[PDB]
Design a protein around this nucleic acid. Structure first.
Length: 278
RNA sequence: GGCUGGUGUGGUACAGAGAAGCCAG
């Protein structure tokens, strides 16, 4: 498995020691072992925030400030989704919608920086909405990115090329903790879930959340050219493809986001008949 | 490329999805 072909980190992992020597705010978290290898403790929220923030400044020229109490995005995964939307819309101005943009507003900042895309970035959480606004303003992108606070993560709001969404993966707290594990001596993950309650869970999990978005798309249809959501669980892909089939959506496709050991999935659909399906 | 169950993740990670992969109806 490989990252997206155009992902800048495909076969080029960041050099932690190089970054440590260049960014003092970062080296505090890197350690090099005796045998000569560098590591972060990805279970430390401050370390992962440092890495993501450092990667965004060194490789993309973005200075972001995010809190430890919300999701800390990981750059390679988010880049795999950005590049897939590039394939979807055929990458003249292109506009997108980011449903639940997070405290980092990372999908708009990347899409605007890489491709000049315009974004409507929505958020339901006061903490994330503030940090998203500040991150758009301090990178001088208020022209391209418009952060809004909405009551619900939905498409039904007061011609667009695409929408993006990190849906809440989980349905209850046990899922949000992963105690739904077969064998108790299962190995724990290498990461942390620092996300807020509206970032990481929803009624009926991502299955019902994405169904909500599917039903929103049935009223909008051609107002957006492509609809897309990421999926955190492989088991969500088949029943959602079936919901698209039962509702009579003509164009449907999906992909895998491959980075590290955790792999993510995504689903896209359209009501146009001109658009090419990757 | 399908689907259904045991196996498989102590780390340049990716909200670990019991995932990719492996075996078999």
């Amino acid at each position: 498995k490989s990252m997206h072909a155009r992902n800048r980190y495909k076969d080029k992992p960041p050099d932690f020691a190089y970054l440590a020597s260049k960014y003092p705010d970062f080296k505090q978290h890197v350690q090099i072992n005796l045998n000569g290898r560098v590591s972060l403790n990805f279970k430390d929220p401050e370390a992962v925030r440092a890495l993501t923030c450092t990667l965004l400044r060194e490789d993309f020229g973005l200075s972001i400030d995010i809190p430890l109490e919300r999701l800390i995005p990981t750059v390679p995964l988010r880049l795999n989704y950005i590049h897939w939307v590039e394939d979807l819309i055929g990458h003249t101005l292109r506009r997108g919608i980011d449903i639940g943009t997070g405290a980092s507003c990372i999908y708009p900042l990347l899409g605007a920086t890489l491709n000049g895309w315009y974004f409507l970035a929505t958020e339901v959480d006061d903490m994330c909405f503030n940090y998203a606004k500040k991150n758009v303003e301090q990178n001088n992108l208020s022209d391209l990115i418009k952060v809004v606070k909405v009551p619900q993560k939905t498409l039904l709001m007061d011609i667009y090329d695409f929408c993006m969404c990190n849906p809440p993966f989980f349905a209850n707290q046990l899922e949000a903790k992963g105690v739904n594990s077969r064998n108790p001596r299962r190995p724990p993950p290498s990461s942390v879930n620092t996300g807020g309650i509206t970032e990481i869970m929803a009624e009926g999990g991502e299955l019902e959340f994405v169904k909500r978005i599917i039903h929103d798309s049935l009223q909008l249809k051609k107002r957006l050219r492509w609809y897309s959501c990421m999926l955190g669980k492989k088991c969500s892909l088949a029943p959602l493809k079936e919901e698209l089939r039962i509702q009579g959506v003509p164009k449907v496709t999906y992909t895998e986001f491959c980075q590290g050991r955790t792999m993510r999935w995504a689903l896209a659909w359209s009501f146009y008949d001109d658009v090419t399906v990757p």
